[PDB]
Design a protein around this ligand. Structure first.
Ligand SMILES: O=C(Nc1cccc(-c2onc3ccc(-c4nn[nH]n4)cc23)c1)C1CC1
Length: 234
C-alpha cells in the first residue's frame, strides 16, 4: 500500500490469480451501469474506487487507486482485522488449506484475526505498532485484551470508539444478512479512530460468487461485536 498526498492509496495487484480477482471485484461493484441494490449498498462499506492505475511509462505495473480511509484523521489509530472462519477459498488445494489453517489454526473457533494495529499514544506523542505475529499469538483466553489494546488512547480506554465500532460493524453485518451472492475469504475490516470512526471492508483477492449466506463472515462479525461489547464493561 502506497499512501498518496491526494488522499488515495495505490494497492499493487498481488500476483495472479489474487490481484486480477480483486480488480474484477472492484470493477463489478463499481460498474457504472450497476443497478444491483446489494452491490450499490456494498459501496458504502468499501474504499471509494478510482479505477485501475498504472505509471505513465509502465503499463505492466498494475495498481488499484482506492480511497485512503485514514486520510480525514489527524492522528489515526488503525487496526486491520481479517474476518471469517476460513482464510482459504473454495478452490484451495489440500496444501493451500493446510498452509492457511497453519497460519492461524484458531480461525474457525474465533472467526477473526488481528493482522496489525497502529495506536497513537498522546502521552509519548508516538505510535505503538503490532505486526501479524501479535494477532496470531492471541487465543480465546487473550483475545479480549488483545483487541482492547487498540483502544488504549487519551489516558483511557476509548469506549466511545469501541461503541462506534460496534455500531458500524452492525451495519456491515446487516448487509451480509441481506445478501446471498458473495462470499468473502481472507478479507479484512479496517478500523480507524482519532487518536489526537471508520470501519471499512478491504482486501478482496478471495471474494467468490455464492448462493448462500456468508456464514463464516457473519460468525466473525458477531464474535467481534461480542468481544467489543464486553470491552464496554471494562
Ligand atoms: O496501518 C494499517 N493499515 C493501513 C494504514 C494506512 C492506510 C490504510 C488504508 O487506508 N485505506 C485503505 C484502503 C485499502 C487498503 C487495503 N486494501 N487491501 N489491502 N489494504 C488499505 C487502506 C491501511 C494496518 C494496521 C497495520
Amino acid at each position: 500500500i502506497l499512501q498518496h498526498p491526494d488522499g488515495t492509496v495505490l494497492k499493487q495487484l498481488q500476483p495472479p490469480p489474487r490481484g486480477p480477482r480483486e480488480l474484477e471485484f472492484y470493477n463489478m461493484v463499481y460498474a457504472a451501469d450497476c443497478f444491483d441494490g446489494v452491490l450499490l449498498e456494498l459501496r458504502k462499506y468499501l474504499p471509494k474506487y478510482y479505477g485501475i492505475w498504472s505509471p505513465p511509462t509502465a503499463p505492466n505495473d498494475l495498481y488499484l487507486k482506492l480511497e485512503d480511509v485514514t486520510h480525514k484523521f489527524n492522528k489515526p489509530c488503525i487496526m486491520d482485522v481479517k474476518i471469517g472462519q476460513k482464510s482459504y477459498d473454495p478452490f484451495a488445494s489440500s496444501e493451500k488449506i493446510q498452509q492457511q489453517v497453519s497460519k492461524y489454526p484458531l480461525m474457525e473457533e474465533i472467526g477473526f484475526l488481528v493482522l496489525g494495529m497502529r495506536v497513537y499514544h498522546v502521552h509519548s506523542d508516538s505510535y505503538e505498532t503490532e505486526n501479524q505475529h501479535y494477532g496470531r499469538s492471541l487465543t480465546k483466553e487473550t483475545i479480549k485484551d488483545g483487541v482492547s489494546r487498540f483502544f488504549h488512547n487519551g489516558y483511557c480506554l476509548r469506549k466511545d470508539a469501541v461503541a462506534a465500532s460496534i455500531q458500524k460493524i452492525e451495519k456491515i453485518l446487516q448487509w451480509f444478512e441481506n445478501q446471498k451472492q458473495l462470499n468473502f475469504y481472507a478479507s479484512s475490516l479496517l478500523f480507524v479512530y482519532e487518536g489526537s470512526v471508520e470501519v471499512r471492508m478491504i482486501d478482496f483477492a478471495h471474494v467468490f460468487p455464492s448462493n448462500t449466506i456468508d456464514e463464516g463472515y457473519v460468525y466473525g462479525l458477531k464474535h467481534l461485536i461480542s468481544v467489543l461489547r464486553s470491552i464496554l464493561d471494562n
